[PDB]
Amino acid sequence: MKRLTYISKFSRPLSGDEIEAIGRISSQKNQQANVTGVLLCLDGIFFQILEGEAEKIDRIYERILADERHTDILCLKSEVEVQERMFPDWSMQTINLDENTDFLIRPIKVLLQTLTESHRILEKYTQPSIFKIISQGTNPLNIRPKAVEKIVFFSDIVSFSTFAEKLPVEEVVSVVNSYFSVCTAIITRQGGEVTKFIGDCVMAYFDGDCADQAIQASLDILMELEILRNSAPEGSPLRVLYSGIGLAKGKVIEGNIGSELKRDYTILGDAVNVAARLEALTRQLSQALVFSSEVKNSATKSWNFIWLTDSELKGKSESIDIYSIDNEMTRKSSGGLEIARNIGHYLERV
Amino acid sequence: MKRLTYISKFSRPLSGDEIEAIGRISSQKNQQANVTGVLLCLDGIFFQILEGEAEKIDRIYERILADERHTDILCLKSEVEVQERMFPDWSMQTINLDENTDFLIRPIKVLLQTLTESHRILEKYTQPSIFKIISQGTNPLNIRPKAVEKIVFFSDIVSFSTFAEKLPVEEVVSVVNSYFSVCTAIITRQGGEVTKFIGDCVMAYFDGDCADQAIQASLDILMELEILRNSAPEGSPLRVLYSGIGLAKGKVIEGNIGSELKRDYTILGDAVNVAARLEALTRQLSQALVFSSEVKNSATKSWNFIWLTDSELKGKSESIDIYSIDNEMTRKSSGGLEIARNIGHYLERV
Ligand SMILES: Cc1cc2nc3c(=O)[nH]c(=O)nc-3n(C[C@H](O)[C@H](O)[C@H](O)COP(=O)(O)O)c2cc1C
Ligand SMILES: Cc1cc2nc3c(=O)[nH]c(=O)nc-3n(C[C@H](O)[C@H](O)[C@H](O)COP(=O)(O)O)c2cc1C
Ligand SMILES: [Mg+2]
Ligand SMILES: [Mg+2]
């Protein structure tokens, strides 16, 4: 058997009658499916436990994910190989805690609502990958560090200091957050994980055998930003939002890194520095994407590679041949320095 | 009136009798102090609400913080100007949920224990400053960005790539985490806040009028690392753990920066880049600490400043005079490059 626990947020106000109606329909359907569980609500938050045969549970959950009456659905626990039902007598027992007045339940409700409102804020400051590990039954704090081969992605905004000096502070933050959103959506879609922001910089990583995905993510980010620039409103700072991207590949250490006050589950190692140093080279080139020969040679698709004969990097060991992709995008460009100059001219006059 | 809500972890196993004994003593004392509230336990976690006159509540809480039977004490909510008591009839009502078998409380306990174990993990991946804001009644997600003058601190480990290549992965992570712990303890003690780790780098900040504290924190970190090196066990990698530190001062933007999957409450702006570029200069100098003339001139104490006549920075606007402190520490050094060479020689032979 399988058992799922999740929390969600009301998408709109729901009356007590509407909540009980959800419970009636849930009980009618779950009884036929040999599914049991409990559904609680407290001040605009749902909490549900569902248990039964795994195939059936998965299909019910996918239907629940399509219900427009809740949103921000977070799976807290996914238990497989469950032996005994927790709620064998309840096809779906509905407990509206807003309406409950029992004297012992009253303090429990206060603590549950305080902890829930804290948790739902902390979620936004937390990586989704952390929640996935917890839901699988593993405490991420006890994962031991390990050496692992990764593709490291590093990107930043071209001439970002100009934004910070020529725009209102609300608009500066809107631009950087738009950029971080674009990068995160595409990296995550390609199976990578964003691990760190610092200033206007993104650091992300992919599995070591996923160079094709790292390259595709990088090209798709550059195309998404081109579309965003061309379609932005008149006078919008997004019209001059440009990126550089560097990719490197190497053995890194993955694990919990930080202090007793705060840590992240992230990566350490030379490929992080190499990716950042390659990304900085894009400021002297017409190409917005550059990557090492190790990334190039690990790819399996027939990419339109171009060798950037020069390899004037610093801090490396045996230098490195550097490559890009030659497409209509990386080609139709007038190069950093010129772009930096235009960014200032444009932003001075918006 | 004031009302405090907090959670804590049992420091050792406590029996049901010991829990009820805490509740008896709490009830006896709180009744005399006109304090009311509730104390819950669930699988090795305490939850407490206390309410009453503010002075009295603060003193009771300080006594509770000294009790050796719990640890990891986190204030979830501090309410001031409370008008009505939540638990007027309970000097301290003790509810041991492990022992409760009520049929409606049974699902509530399961959800409370799932949410609590998630929250206590998320705490370690979260900044303490976030929890402080939440406890004061503010949702940090809704704080608007603002321009603000800050001192920015940036530090990294000298020749860190050597550690990652010559030591077992568990030992590499132990070293970096020791370094991040040392920095965090001292920065926080001096009123600053650590905001970002990336690789082996620390980024922190202080209020704009706290240059003295940023300088003191920097000197105290360098002295703590000297003590750590000299007292490390035979053959320990901590014997060759060295730091560089750069400090800059400028207007930055403070606010929520990130994606829909993940954000931090942090800072953006040119002082971040300047501090990192000053810290990199320490690799060409005997001095481990360097800072801008703006930091120097904002200090109020009679520091033993030394002007590093050269100011060969890059990327700046009108360059910058660069300073350090000349003490027995920054003086008794043989300079980067030489230090980098020694780090490799030592770590190759441990
Ligand atoms: C919080 C919440 C919990 C729900 N739980 C269940 C459930 O346990 N079983 C179920 O079949 N539907 C559940 N639903 C409803 C489904 O989302 C959907 O409305 C229903 O299954 C459609 O059934 P019908 O097509 O017969 O009307 C839930 C909905 C919400 C908002
Ligand atoms: C979880 C926990 C909650 C407590 N709550 C109270 C309280 O509400 N009021 C109080 O006076 N002591 C409380 N205490 C106890 C104090 O920490 C301390 O033991 C007690 O006040 C000492 O009183 P005594 O010196 O008369 O023995 C609590 C202890 C623990 C572990
Ligand atoms: Mg930039
Ligand atoms: Mg370093």
CSV table of C-alpha atoms and ligand atoms in Angstrom, one decimal, chain B residues 6 22 25-26 29-30 39 46 48 50 60 63-64 67 69-70 92, ligand 2:
chain,number,residue,atom,x,y,z
B,6,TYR,CA,7.9,28.5,21.0
B,22,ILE,CA,7.2,20.1,34.7
B,25,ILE,CA,5.8,23.3,38.8
B,26,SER,CA,4.9,25.5,35.9
B,29,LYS,CA,4.7,29.3,39.6
B,30,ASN,CA,2.5,30.8,36.8
B,39,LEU,CA,2.3,23.1,27.2
B,46,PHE,CA,7.7,20.6,23.2
B,48,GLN,CA,4.4,26.1,24.6
B,50,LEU,CA,2.7,31.7,27.7
B,60,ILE,CA,10.0,33.3,32.9
B,63,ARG,CA,14.5,30.7,33.0
B,64,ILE,CA,13.0,28.3,30.5
B,67,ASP,CA,16.5,24.5,31.5
B,69,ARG,CA,15.9,19.3,29.6
B,70,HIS,CA,15.3,20.9,26.2
B,92,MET,CA,-0.3,26.0,32.7
C,2,LIG,C1,9.2,22.7,28.2
C,2,LIG,C2,9.4,23.4,29.6
C,2,LIG,C3,8.4,24.4,29.8
C,2,LIG,C4,8.4,25.1,31.0
C,2,LIG,N1,7.4,26.1,31.3
C,2,LIG,C5,7.5,26.8,32.6
C,2,LIG,C6,6.5,27.8,32.9
C,2,LIG,O1,5.5,28.0,32.1
C,2,LIG,N2,6.6,28.6,34.1
C,2,LIG,C7,7.8,28.3,35.0
C,2,LIG,O2,7.9,28.9,36.0
C,2,LIG,N3,8.7,27.3,34.6
C,2,LIG,C8,8.6,26.6,33.4
C,2,LIG,N4,9.5,25.6,33.2
C,2,LIG,C9,10.6,25.3,34.2
C,2,LIG,C10,11.7,26.2,34.4
C,2,LIG,O3,12.5,26.0,33.3
C,2,LIG,C11,12.3,25.9,35.8
C,2,LIG,O4,12.6,24.5,35.9
C,2,LIG,C12,11.4,26.3,36.9
C,2,LIG,O5,10.8,27.5,36.7
C,2,LIG,C13,12.2,26.3,38.2
C,2,LIG,O6,11.3,26.6,39.2
C,2,LIG,P1,11.8,26.2,40.8
C,2,LIG,O7,13.1,26.9,40.9
C,2,LIG,O8,10.7,26.6,41.8
C,2,LIG,O9,12.0,24.7,40.9
C,2,LIG,C14,9.5,24.8,31.9
C,2,LIG,C15,10.4,23.9,31.6
C,2,LIG,C16,10.4,23.2,30.4
C,2,LIG,C17,11.4,22.1,30.0
